[PDB]
Structure 1
């Protein structure tokens, strides 16, 4: 497979002062093959499959 080449964003990371070095939120916009399990209508009308 070709290698992913992306941008990693350490924005909003502040320096807590006494404690442990700790991570709050990791997120990434890549994903695996997801086949089909279910589908649902939501209260606003977003017909959305999981």
Structure 2
């Protein structure tokens, strides 16, 4: 019953210079399972932050 994944994949800065064999160099996305507070810390700008 969970929804799908609407991802706009972008292959920016891709080149074909006969660079040996095809391979990946960078990959990132913006999804995650929910997480629980493990630790926390304070930064000297004022803002606390939990990890």
Q: Give the alignment's TM-score, normalised by structure 2.
A: 0.71
Give distance in 2, aligned partners of 1:43 and 1:14: 42
Q: Are residues 18 and 31 of structure 1, via their aligned partners in 2, closer, same or farther at CA, if it must alter by over 3 Å?
A: same
Residue 3 of structure 2 corresponds to 2
Q: Which runs of 5+ in 2 are unaligned?
A: none
Residue 44 of structure 2 corresponds to 43
Cα RMSD (Å): 1.8
Question: Rg larger in 1 or in 2?
Answer: 2
Give distance in 1, aligned partners of 2:44 and 2:24: 33
Q: Give the alignment's TM-score, normalised by structure 1.
A: 0.72
